[PDB]
Design a protein around this ligand. Structure first.
Ligand SMILES: [Cl-]
Ligand SMILES: [Cl-]
Ligand SMILES: [Zn+2]
Ligand SMILES: [Zn+2]
Lengths: 28, 21, 26, 21, 28, 21, 28, 27, 21, 28, 21, 21
């Protein structure tokens, strides 16, 4: 689904900002 | 996962923070 | 400079890695 | 890491792919 | 849905660009 | 607001200019 | 400065996420 | 709007994917 | 075009590459 | 060449908005 | 201002929050 | 080209429109 795809793109951006030095795990 | 919870409803900074490492 | 670059990296990794995804550490 | 390798010189797609998990 | 949130995110990008040195006000 | 006007239909550059200072 | 210009774009993007319903006043 | 937003991500994707080749964007 | 092929089903790196010069 | 690469990313975004239905040819 | 603090040095979310309305 | 003209000094939208096809 392209809607999940576009949303996920904004999620990793938010996580990038929010999680900081901890970083994060992304997996669909 | 993060998609069902945060792509169906907007997640707060606090909700997003749960998926931090 | 590094924070801005890293933002584009994560966007790039999101696209390139596909179903695998990735782990982001600074 | 990825910042050292790809924020000083541009990394190609394949080079970026190295950091997929 | 998060459509309005995703949309607003692209809106502030466009306003940043259209407005130049003037800048803008952002209120939902 | 801007969301009502520009998230249902694409706003022109002129319409975007409305929210400039 | 184009580097300053690129940075501000990421700033308004970030403020959009952080400020939520508060919104913000972008002014260079 | 959704089609516009999708296009915004597509041209970013092409910028990355096409590299030195670049691309031709037409709506 | 690319919008028709890539805005409902996700296009792969390979599929996107078809629209490069 | 990271600065030129980051700039190019924002340039195409900008072109995407400004050109509307005209579209644009992007070439490094 | 925000450029001095967040473009020469990295700003956290908490730091960004100071520039909210 | 556009990189030469617009990546050290800011190009306005009006200036950018010159590169539309
Ligand atoms: Cl989107
Ligand atoms: Cl940047
Ligand atoms: Zn988007
Ligand atoms: Zn950038």
């Amino acid at each position: 689904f392209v809607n999940q795809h576009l949303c996920g793109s904004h999620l990793v951006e938010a996580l990038y900002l929010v999680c900081g030095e901890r970083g994060f795990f992304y997996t669909p | 996962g993060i998609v069902e919870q945060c792509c169906t409803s907007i997640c707060s900074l606090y909700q997003l923070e749960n998926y931090c490492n």
